[PDB]
């Protein structure tokens, strides 16, 4: 349907974004709580990012899965764009990791399972996220992971996939090396994530983006001794230089470390 500001009661602010603010809000008809993200056109246009917003809306509106943040719809006015989003009451995984500094194996495995299901659902529609990282993960009321921020996502048949995008510590080697990419870039970024969850910092971290690029390109990283055998195996399978050697998400879901540590529904 159509939407306008008049269809929502607005509550307190939930956070400060780069180009706006997110508010708690409630749809009058249904009385359904949700979040309403407000973006200022002036700030979007200044930063150059409207194309990312188009992409986010056009893709994410179509995605309906328990572990993907719903984008119910959008609308806009002379000054603002509004995104109507599912409310994630437990906040970002980024903030959870800041608090706890590292996650244990159960929490980690359970989140990797949720994220893999969601990316399975994306990849069947031939959609690739391309920006998996802790800031783009939110948490439902039962603590269940929700991937969001489809700004840098792409539908594979509709793109050439030769430009680099994403976030420094999470970028796959293929993009750094200038090659055509596919759904396997999500697989790489999943492995970086699993590592960062377990260790509390990403594997290719360095003082400049140059060193970080070199280190990714050469898959130069080591694990601390605390990381178990099974986690090490899973991550090492995800962080292969050669995209075609990375597992399918099915195989990630069936990995024995994942099986042994993931919580039951």
């Amino acid at each position: 349907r159509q939407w306008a500001l008049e269809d929502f009661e607005i509550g307190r602010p939930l956070g400060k974004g780069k180009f706006g603010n997110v508010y708690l809000a409630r749809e009058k008809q249904s009385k359904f709580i949700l979040a309403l993200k407000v973006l200022f056109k002036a700030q979007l246009e200044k930063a150059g990012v409207e194309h990312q917003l188009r992409r986010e809306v056009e893709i994410q509106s179509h995605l309906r899965h328990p572990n993907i943040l719903r984008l119910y719809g959008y609308f806009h006015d002379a000054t603002r764009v509004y995104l109507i989003l599912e409310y994630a009451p437990l906040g970002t995984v980024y903030r959870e990791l800041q608090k706890l500094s590292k996650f244990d194996e159960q929490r980690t495995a359970t989140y990797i399972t949720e994220l893999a299901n969601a990316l399975s659902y994306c990849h069947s529609k031939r959609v690739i996220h391309r920006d998996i990282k802790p800031e783009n993960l939110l948490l439902g009321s039962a603590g269940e992971l929700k991937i969001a921020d489809f700004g840098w996502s792409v539908h594979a048949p509709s793109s050439r996939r030769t430009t680099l995008c994403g976030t420094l510590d999470y970028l796959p080697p293929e993009m750094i090396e200038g090659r055509m990419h596919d759904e396997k870039v999500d697989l790489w970024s999943l492995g970086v994530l699993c590592y960062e969850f377990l260790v509390g910092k990403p594997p290719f971290e360095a003082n400049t983006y140059q060193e970080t690029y070199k280190r990714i390109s050469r898959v130069e990283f080591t694990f601390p001794d605390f990381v178990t055998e099974g986690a090490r195996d899973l991550i090492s399978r995800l962080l292969k230089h050669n995209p075609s050697q990375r597992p399918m998400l099915r195989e990630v879901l069936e990995h024995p470390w994942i099986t042994a540590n993931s919580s039951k529904p």
Partner: protein, 88 residues
């Protein structure tokens, strides 16, 4: 503009990458239509999600003039059709 990227005797790969939209006006889906230029059966149709920039039309009859038309359906708008004629 609308373009035919590739054709077989029974199928066309079409592409509307060239078509541009108004700032902040986002596409929900495309209505894709095709039939035999002038001489009549019902023009056939289907829709794809707005994030598609190309699509395949299959099961066409060889040696036929088609007219292919695409309607970009915004969440808040309808863009006026772009179309193209092609002969299998």
């Amino acid at each position: 503009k609308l373009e035919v990227v590739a054709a077989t005797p029974t199928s066309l790969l079409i592409s509307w990458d060239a078509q541009t939209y108004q700032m902040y006006d986002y596409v929900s889906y495309y209505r894709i239509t095709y039939g035999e230029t002038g001489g009549n059966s019902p023009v056939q149709e289907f829709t794809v999600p707005g994030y598609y920039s190309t699509a395949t039309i299959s099961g066409l009859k060889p040696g036929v003039d088609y007219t292919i038309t695409v309607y970009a359906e915004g969440y808040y708008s309808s863009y006026s059709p772009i179309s193209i004629n092609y002969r299998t």
